[PDB]
Amino acid sequence: MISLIAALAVDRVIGMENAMPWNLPADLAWFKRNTLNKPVIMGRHTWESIGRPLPGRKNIILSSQPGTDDRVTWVKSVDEAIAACGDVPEIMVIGGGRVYEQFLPKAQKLYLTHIDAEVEGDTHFPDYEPDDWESVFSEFHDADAQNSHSYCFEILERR
Ligand SMILES: NC(=O)c1ccc[n+]([C@@H]2O[C@H](COP(=O)([O-])OP(=O)(O)OC[C@H]3O[C@@H](n4cnc5c(N)ncnc54)[C@H](OP(=O)(O)O)[C@@H]3O)[C@@H](O)[C@H]2O)c1
Numbered sequence: 001m002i003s004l005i006a007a008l009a010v011d012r013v014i015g016m017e018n019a020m021p022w023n024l025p026a027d028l029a030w031f032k033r034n035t036l037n038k039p040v041i042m043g044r045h046t047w048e049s050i051g052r053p054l055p056g057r058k059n060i061i062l063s064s065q066p067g068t069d070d071r072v073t074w075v076k077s078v079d080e081a082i083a084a085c086g087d088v089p090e091i092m093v094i095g096g097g098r099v100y101e102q103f104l105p106k107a108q109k110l111y112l113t114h115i116d117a118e119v120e121g122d123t124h125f126p127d128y129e130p131d132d133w134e135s136v137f138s139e140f141h142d143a144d145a146q147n148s149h150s151y152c153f154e155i156l157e158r159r
């Protein structure tokens with residue numbers, strides 16, 4: 001089973017200038033809990049943005065060019081990326097925009113954080129047909145001293 005996990009600001013913005021400009025520790029904690037002990041697939045630009053391997057996960061990087069770091073696994077196609085995960089219950093696709101586009105048609109689950117923040121970005125999460133997806137979990141949080149915007153965690157399952 002393939003799942004996508006992402007945090008979306010207003011208008012489905014996910015990044016600007018190869019970065020995420022907000023800081024929401026509660027959402028990074030949610031990301032860690034939902035990805036630990038699972039393989040994670042990311043594109044090369046996201047790998048450069050994170051800047052190190054994510055511990056406790058098998059890190060698989062998509063790139064058309066040879067890998068430059070043997071602490072992670074490098075693959076050259078979507079099918080190779082999936083194969084490199086092995087026989088696991090759930091594969092997590094962690095972006096970015098181009099990678100989410102390719103994996104959305106193959107995904108059964110979306111873990112989305114909706115952040116109440118306006119930022120002028122250059123990368124968007126794919127348009128997803130709402131009728132295809134059922135909301136199975138949602139949890140709203142107001143802003144607090146650690147998290148400067150309100151946010152909503154949602155899990156959607158393909159109908
Ligand atoms: N808010 C969030 O949840 C979130 C999550 C992840 C990322 N982001 C943000 O998203 C942005 C990066 O997204 P992006 O769309 O620019 O890049 P991306 O999807 O991370 O990476 C694209 C790169 O991945 C490789 N790639 C993708 N598909 C491939 C395929 N089928 N075969 C081979 N290689 C393939 C290519 O690398 P080569 O050029 O080497 O071939 C391509 O240039 C950053 O701003 C980041 O901060 C946000």
Ligand SMILES: Nc1nc(=O)c2nc(CNc3ccc(C(=O)N[C@@H](CCC(=O)O)C(=O)O)cc3)cnc2[nH]1
Binds near residue numbers: 030
């Ligand atoms: N909901 C969500 N939030 C995100 O920030 C996010 N980020 C990415 C890609 N970028 C990043 C950037 C940093 C870290 C990171 O530092 N993670 C640590 C944090 C642990 C914690 O804060 O408790 C990790 O071990 O996962 C992960 C992904 C993909 N999907 C996401 N999905």
Ligand SMILES: [Mn+2]
Binds near residue numbers: 077079
């Ligand atoms: Mn092929």
Ligand SMILES: [Mn+2]
Binds near residue numbers: 086087
């Ligand atoms: Mn198999």
Ligand SMILES: [Mn+2]
Binds near residue numbers: 116117118148149150
């Ligand atoms: Mn806000």
